[PDB]
Design a protein around this ligand. Sequence first.
Ligand SMILES: Cc1cn([C@H]2C[C@H](O)[C@@H](COP(=O)(O)OP(=O)(O)OP(=O)(O)O)O2)c(=O)[nH]c1=O
Ligand code: NA
Length: 342
Amino acid sequence: GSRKIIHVDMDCFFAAVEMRDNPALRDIPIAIGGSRERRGVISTANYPARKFGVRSAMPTGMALKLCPHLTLLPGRFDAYKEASNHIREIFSRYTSRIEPLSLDEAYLDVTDSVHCHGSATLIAQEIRQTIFNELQLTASAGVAPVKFLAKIASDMNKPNGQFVITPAEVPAFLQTLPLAKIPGVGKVSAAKLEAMGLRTCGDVQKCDLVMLLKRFGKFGRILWERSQGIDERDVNSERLRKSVGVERTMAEDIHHWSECEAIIERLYPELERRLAKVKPDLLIARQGVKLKFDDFQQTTQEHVWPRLNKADLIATARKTWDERRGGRGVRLVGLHVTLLDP
DNA sequence: TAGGGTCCTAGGACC
DNA sequence: GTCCTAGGACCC
Ligand SMILES: Cc1cn([C@H]2C[C@H](O)[C@@H](COP(=O)(O)OP(=O)(O)OP(=O)(O)O)O2)c(=O)[nH]c1=O
Ligand code: NA
């Protein structure tokens, strides 16, 4: 065998950072997200705002109809990154087996740990306490014998808490667990699963793997495994970024190539700057563009290409503009880069 | 009805 | 098989 996996997850991460750096926001409803006038969405919200129904990914117009006094912040990504680096350094104090999934969360493999008398529970507890002491931010944690159960667990005693799932507890936990709580089972999948009478891990246990493989491919094997507590994925501390993208949704749809070209001229220096931080010679594997139309269809056009080049992105966007727009208006323009393999 | 990404699928090209 | 490209589901 049994591993001890901890998933650490910061509470209301972006919003928690803003309230720490401005205590005036502590008890009023706030949210990081673009304005209604920019057609933006909520990145996240504090608990005063969540009380009204405000959620990550909600259109900002909907947020404000639910919570008219919502205070809207633009977001300070360097401040989030600074806090992320700090908590990761704190993780390193306890193990090198750290797989971060995002700025604010990480899997830890504490199986071969010596710290708190081998206790994963006490280790998770003083990570959360150390985070609070050194950053004035709170985290929740989940402790389980595999990654996905640890992740489900870190959500269950949020904010500022934790939850532990022992292998003895695993079967009762699974029996009623809704499928939609498994990472990677989203709305489309959960609706497909519901349309055949499958709601929970107990429901999936009672059905045949061969059928699940037909109907969901490799995904159906994942569902079958997870519904049994089976998650052999190792905590991997060696993953690297593979792409970088820069895209923008305009406050109004554009209808003229000249407007599209202007957008790209402003997007391109931001893409070069971010690429250079990680590859100073701008050498890349592919580059490409993205248009999202008014019928919310999205198209991408990307090709092998050795080195970030503005004119070829303009050229490609022009081809895409002409060949695939079919007269509809355009809400989004994006530039994209696929990085070399090593 | 964002912007930052990952992983998977699938057809044709190419070997 | 494996590369190329396009698109979709999903996560934070
Ligand atoms: C889900 C989500 C998160 N984010 C950002 C803001 C979040 O603070 C950060 C981490 O996401 P989460 O861990 O999903 O959410 P959270 O920290 O805000 O809330 P919770 O306490 O329930 O865990 O990433 C988005 O920008 N868009 C999204 O759709
Ligand atoms: Na979080």
